[PDB]
Design a protein around this ligand. Structure first.
Ligand SMILES: CCC1=C(C)/C(=C/C2=NC(=C\c3[nH]c(/C=C4\NC(=O)[C@H](C)[C@H]4CC)c(C)c3CCC(=O)O)/C(CCC(=O)O)=C2C)NC1=O
Ligand SMILES: CCC1=C(C)/C(=C/C2=NC(=C\c3[nH]c(/C=C4\NC(=O)[C@H](C)[C@H]4CC)c(C)c3CCC(=O)O)/C(CCC(=O)O)=C2C)NC1=O
Ligand SMILES: CCC1=C(C)/C(=C/C2=NC(=C\c3[nH]c(/C=C4\NC(=O)[C@H](C)[C@H]4CC)c(C)c3CCC(=O)O)/C(CCC(=O)O)=C2C)NC1=O
Ligand SMILES: CCC1=C(C)/C(=C/C2=NC(=C\c3[nH]c(/C=C4\NC(=O)[C@H](C)[C@H]4CC)c(C)c3CCC(=O)O)/C(CCC(=O)O)=C2C)NC1=O
Ligand SMILES: CCC1=C(C)/C(=C/C2=NC(=C\c3[nH]c(/C=C4\NC(=O)[C@H](C)[C@H]4CC)c(C)c3CCC(=O)O)/C(CCC(=O)O)=C2C)NC1=O
Ligand SMILES: CCC1=C(C)/C(=C/C2=NC(=C\c3[nH]c(/C=C4\NC(=O)[C@H](C)[C@H]4CC)c(C)c3CCC(=O)O)/C(CCC(=O)O)=C2C)NC1=O
Ligand SMILES: CCC1=C(C)/C(=C/C2=NC(=C\c3[nH]c(/C=C4\NC(=O)[C@H](C)[C@H]4CC)c(C)c3CCC(=O)O)/C(CCC(=O)O)=C2C)NC1=O
Ligand SMILES: CCC1=C(C)/C(=C/C2=NC(=C\c3[nH]c(/C=C4\NC(=O)[C@H](C)[C@H]4CC)c(C)c3CCC(=O)O)/C(CCC(=O)O)=C2C)NC1=O
Ligand SMILES: CCC1=C(C)/C(=C/C2=NC(=C\c3[nH]c(/C=C4\NC(=O)[C@H](C)[C@H]4CC)c(C)c3CCC(=O)O)/C(CCC(=O)O)=C2C)NC1=O
Ligand SMILES: CCC1=C(C)/C(=C/C2=NC(=C\c3[nH]c(/C=C4\NC(=O)[C@H](C)[C@H]4CC)c(C)c3CCC(=O)O)/C(CCC(=O)O)=C2C)NC1=O
Lengths: 162, 246, 172, 162, 172, 172
């Protein structure tokens, strides 16, 4: 994981000198914006089921064929693991919000995304529409700066999917 | 009566009739015809590379030498190394080091360590260091040990100061032990001209500078020229864009 | 490279004096209104694939010359190079937008593009047209009041426009 | 390109040696089945329009939604552009047959495929279906060795799409 | 680099077409004389030291100034360089003879040779004379009906000759 | 890395004698069966993506902890590496099938794979079961009598089964 302070220690240990003004300043700013990130993560922690089921129904309604027989969206276990995948995306966005760094995201989802989507025939369009729906509900649930910081890690996940 | 059954009369003399015939008659087939037409500036798959001198150097396969090798890929990797590191300069049988090759064959040193030994060898010095200014030496070091041209003047300043303070061995180590060599070539890949394809972080100029350094597949970093291995990128580095006359 | 603080500092040092209270005011205003700059830079970064997709679509629709066989963007490898160049230039405009000075762009980015593309034979005119298309496809992402606090940012729009114009005019 | 001849020349040049018996034996094999390859190229060139049109119809048949309005496949422009793409793929299969190697495919189609597809939101599965259709028809068109060599180049393309 | 097949493929592609039937007839022919081409290449390869030695002997008997002190083949270093250049040129001629296309010569062998020799002060006249002597030596081994089932192959002699002239004209 | 012909050559050198007619007959038999061997390796390479996806589905069906958090394959890149390593072992098994020698896989990697999978803490029996499922899915594809002239290939199936068995046992 590469969080802001983790970036600080990493970019420091490579060279000789200690943590100068710039690194202390970056850690400082992260330490302010962390607490709003914590409350945003809490607000996002109350609504697992609503977010996941809304996103699932949104991606199903955008793609009518996956539901239809003969397609990989068909199935009880398939839809259950759809829900588990969206829960995974939600929890890893939560982890990123808590850490104030894209470390958990890059570690747990984005690393090896392409190859596995290749081998298991998953389409990133489904997950990208799910993330857009989650963006939509974060628009209403969260307000102001908390909304901004949540949306920034979210659309980072979009940028990773695309 | 049948002609009138076609529909109400349409006034004649419309100047858009030919446009209608094109937009109506077999649009898909016609569109395929224009889509697959040749482009009046004809460029092959490798028109850009052939327009540079450097196609033979891009098409050249990457050569690697992992520890369990039998005989012949070794004899080929030695040729590739002595061709690249020494810059296509002839290395007579006497100049070729036997101890370093034995070390490589045993496996006590990786290909990167062997590159380091050859860079500290007397052939590399006598060709690139001893007969050339420091600018030309830094250019050659970048081109030969990194596959790229220098990106800016701060590289020359830093390496000149590193040499002046710590010596040739430290100067060479700054190239081979650098993170860039390790990420691009690592322990077991022979260096190659990678600056022809966009390398992450390069300036716009690095491509032009590598073209200036290359001099073709036949050419070399000889120093036996009538000139004596002058530096090529002296003004392209500190005046990257402009040109000045004395 | 140089942001605006470093640039003003260099101009002060060349005259060999402290920074005037006027330039202190300019830099204070820049720092106060750099939050809007952060927003504009984020708008370019999150929406980069969309900008490149739109610019590519309109460029190759406008010019069948590039994608026809024998064209300069045809062989499906030169095509990835085209999209990569668009990525690089939009990246560098985002850098020069966050910084505040075109030094990042015209130093780290575009001293050698004209003659690089001339050495590869590619049309530099089409590259300038691609950059203009990127500009047009980017401003629409850049003005969006959706999920961003409402305010006036016309200076930042002019700044992004002049960075895109500089890149296009240099490459051309 | 990477023919048999060209790959041999490159591997002998990188070692700075002449062509020894192994290289000439490989070149002899290449020249020896140049005839089945050229015959398969001649067939796949003669039966051009049938192959392309059947492949396009197979893409639509397996992908109903693509023909539906308001999205990717609808519009005679996209229709003709699909036909152009399949003509490209078949062209490069016959190029590979002639060049007794995967030179032309790798140079034109295969290299740069996935970035360009993801940039234009083109689905690999469409092209995989078109090449499966071409596989089925060229099974009928060709018999003996030409059949096998063609099929080799088709599934090479299919694998690269996969 | 292009063999004859890849050259014809590129020509077809620039026209945005499949390969015509005359082109496939020609390539089928080229693959039908491939065995004779292989014998020619193997006669160049087996007799390489003999050709180099014959050409060197005749070149230095002819041009004696190359080996006087001060000439541009005097010490052992630049004599070994002579022999190395000649061996390389025969190598690339045999490469192009196998491929059937002179693209390897321009791509690799003759990419910067004129510049190297003008920089070094090497007399390009003498290098071209070496290549011509090499051609004369090679044809003797090419036309050797011994150990190969007799037939007509004058096309291959013409091809090898024109490769040698290509290299000689590029250098000189 | 070594093939069966060079095993005969090496043992002949070790005993110091010329190759015996018995081993020469064995090598002739192998060389004529090489036509079927080429189709076997071609089937493997052709069906490799389908085979690996199939075996991944069967494995993730039979073994589930690789899904749950804390399981080895739960982090996304880790099961990406699962698929990649499955592909690598299939590629090496295709190499071995073409060569006819099992050491090209074993001596190449299995020495370090044992200690690597011991240190990493992965369930190595799961990797052995992955090799077994790989073998089964490849066996399904190798018996495809369509597209190929019908012949006798029981020995090839036995060879593939034993190669995969040895690979798994060295893993196990
Ligand atoms: C580390 C975090 C992580 C991610 C991101 C992940 C993606 C993922 N989803 C999978 C299964 C799946 N996932 C889906 C869900 C998609 N398909 C439908 O069309 C939906 C619209 C859409 C949901 C948004 C489906 C249908 C499968 C079935 C494929 C199978 O049989 O495994 C699989 C195959 C293995 C398995 O989970 O059993 C992976 C690797 N897995 C992970 O462990
Ligand atoms: C640091 C000083 C140094 C030492 C000590 C050294 C010895 C040495 N001998 C080697 C191989 C060898 N060494 C020998 C010599 C022995 N075998 C015969 O029976 C002889 C009786 C006897 C010699 C007195 C032989 C025959 C080989 C070949 C083995 C092989 O190629 O695998 C190797 C590995 C391959 C290579 O050199 O390329 C080394 C490192 N080299 C060094 O640079
Ligand atoms: C190994 C032999 C060798 C030498 C010595 C050499 C000189 C040299 N001087 C340089 C800069 C410089 N040289 C000078 C010196 C001048 N300033 C004043 O006017 C003085 C009158 C005068 C010195 C007596 C200065 C000030 C710089 C820095 C200019 C800059 O950073 O732009 C640089 C490039 C950048 C750097 O070093 O930071 C070189 C390469 N080049 C070589 O290859
Ligand atoms: C860091 C700053 C930087 C930039 C911007 C940069 C651009 C750049 N683009 C290149 C290739 C290319 N770029 C293009 C794109 C052009 N062709 C069409 O006209 C399009 C309209 C147009 C795109 C706007 C093409 C086609 C090539 C390949 C040329 C060839 O292979 O013949 C190359 C040569 C390396 C390669 O072949 O991959 C460079 C150096 N390099 C840099 O270091
Ligand atoms: C982590 C990265 C990060 C970002 C991106 C960021 C943006 C940011 N934008 C803000 C408000 C603002 N944002 C803008 C910019 C808007 N003006 C126009 O409406 C456009 C839609 C758009 C730019 C073209 C403006 C004008 C304000 C209010 C400032 C003012 O007018 O006084 C604020 C102050 C409090 C808030 O409303 O959130 C922040 C912190 N802060 C961060 O820490
Ligand atoms: C070297 C060989 C080569 C290939 C393979 C290639 C693929 C390719 N297809 C393209 C367009 C396209 N290709 C398709 C896909 C087809 N349309 C649908 O009817 C079908 C379902 C589907 C095929 C089965 C579509 C829909 C577009 C237009 C996409 C857009 O305009 O955004 C484009 C963008 C150029 C343009 O805008 O016209 C490329 C680069 N290009 C090449 O030069
Ligand atoms: C594409 C393959 C290739 C070629 C063709 C090639 C030519 C070549 N010949 C060279 C030297 C040379 N080449 C010659 C050749 C001629 N001089 C004449 O008198 C004779 C006809 C003949 C004498 C043997 C000589 C004499 C030298 C030595 C020049 C010197 O060291 O001063 C050099 C470099 C000089 C140095 O080592 O610094 C090159 C690059 N190099 C290559 O990598
Ligand atoms: C291991 C590498 C390898 C080689 C070297 C090879 C050569 C080769 N030469 C052949 C015959 C031949 N070879 C030649 C060429 C020779 N005729 C002379 O007059 C010329 C001096 C000379 C041309 C330079 C000719 C004319 C034939 C008779 C068959 C034909 O014309 O195609 C044949 C066909 C068998 C036969 O009819 O005898 C082969 C396969 N094949 C290989 O797999
Ligand atoms: C080219 C030859 C080669 C092989 C074969 C090889 C095996 C190998 N697999 C690794 C990672 C891994 N390999 C696996 C796969 C296993 N885990 C279970 O889920 C599956 C039953 C099973 C799939 C076959 C996993 C999950 C990891 C991740 C462990 C980690 O990253 O910490 C690693 C650690 C470093 C790395 O290479 O990424 C090695 C050395 N390495 C090589 O260089
Ligand atoms: C282009 C690359 C290439 C391949 C692939 C190749 C293999 C190859 N397989 C052949 C037939 C054959 N192919 C097979 C193998 C199949 N038979 C079935 O029973 C098995 C399930 C299956 C094994 C995978 C067999 C057994 C023969 C006939 C040979 C015999 O008499 O046993 C033939 C001769 C055609 C004929 O007999 O009419 C060749 C050249 N050669 C090549 O140059």
């Amino acid at each position: 994981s590469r969080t802001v302070i983790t970036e600080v220690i990493a970019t420091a240990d490579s060279q000789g000198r200690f943590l100068n003004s710039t690194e202390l300043q970056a850690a400082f700013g992260r330490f302010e914006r962390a607490v709003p990130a914590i409350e945003a993560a809490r607000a996002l922690t109350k609504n697992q089921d609503a977010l996941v089921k809304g996103a699932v129904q949104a991606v199903f309604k955008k793609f009518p064929y996956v539901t239809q027989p003969g397609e990989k969206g068909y199935g009880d276990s398939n839809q259950a693991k759809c829900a588990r995948d969206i829960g995974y995306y939600l929890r890893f966005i939560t982890y990123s919000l808590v850490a104030s760094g894209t470390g958990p995201l890059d570690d747990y989802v984005i690393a090896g995304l392409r190859e596995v989507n290749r081998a298991f025939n998953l389409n990133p369009l489904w997950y990208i529409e799910a993330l857009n729906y989650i963006k939509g509900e974060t628009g209403k649930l969260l307000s102001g700066q908390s909304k901004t910081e949540a949306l920034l890690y979210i659309d980072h996940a979009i940028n990773a999917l695309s | 009566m049948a002609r009138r059954m076609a529909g109400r009369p349409v006034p004649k003399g419309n100047p858009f009739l030919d446009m209608a015939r094109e937009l109506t008659d077999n649009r898909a087939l016609t569109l395929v015809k224009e889509f697959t037409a040749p482009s009046p500036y004809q460029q092959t798959e490798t028109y850009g590379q052939e327009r540079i001198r450097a196609l033979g150097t891009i098409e050249a396969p990457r050569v690697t030498l992992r520890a369990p090798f039998t005989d012949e890929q070794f004899q080929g990797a030695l040729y590739a190394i002595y061709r690249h590191i020494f810059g296509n300069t002839y290395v007579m049988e006497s100049e070729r080091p036997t101890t370093a090759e034995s070390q490589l064959k045993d496996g006590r040193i990786t290909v990167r360590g062997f590159i380091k030994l050859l860079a500290k060898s007397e052939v590399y010095r006598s060709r690139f260091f001893q007969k050339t200014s420091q600018n030309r030496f830094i250019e050659l070091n970048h081109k030969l040990l990194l596959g790229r041209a220098p990106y800016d003047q701060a590289e020359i300043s830093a390496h000149l100061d590193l040499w002046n303070t710590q010596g040739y061995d430290a100067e060479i180590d700054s190239y081979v032990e650098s993170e860039e060599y390790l990420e691009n070539f690592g322990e077991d890949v022979i260096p190659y001209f990678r600056g022809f394809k966009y390398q992450t972080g390069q300036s716009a100029q690095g491509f032009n500078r590598l073209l200036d350094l290359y001099g073709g597949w036949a050419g070399s970093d000889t120093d036996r020229n009538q000139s004596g291995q002058v530096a090529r990128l002296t003004n392209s580095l500190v005046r990257p864009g402009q040109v000045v006359e004395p | 490279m140089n942001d605006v603080f470093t640039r003003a500092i260099a101009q002060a040092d060349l005259k060999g004096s402290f920074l005037l209270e006027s330039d202190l005011d300019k830099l204070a205003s820049f720092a106060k209104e750099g939050v809007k700059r952060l927003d504009a830079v984020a708008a370019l970064t999150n929406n980069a694939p969309a900008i490149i997709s739109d610019a590519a679509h309109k460029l190759f629709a406008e010019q069948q010359e590039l994608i026809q066989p024998g064209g300069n963007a045809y062989p499906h490898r030169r095509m990835a190079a085209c999209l990569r160049d668009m990525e690089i230039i939009l990246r560098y405009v985002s850098y020069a937008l966050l910084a505040g000075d075109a030094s990042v762009l015209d130093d780290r980015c575009l001293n050698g593009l004209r003659e690089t593309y001339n050495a590869l034979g590619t049309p530099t005119q089409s590259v300038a047209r691609a950059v203009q298309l990127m500009k047009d496809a980017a401003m629409v992402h850049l003005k969006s009041t959706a999920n961003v606090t409402v305010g006036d940012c016309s200076s930042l729009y002019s700044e992004a426009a002049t960075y895109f114009d500089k890149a296009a005019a240099s490459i051309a």
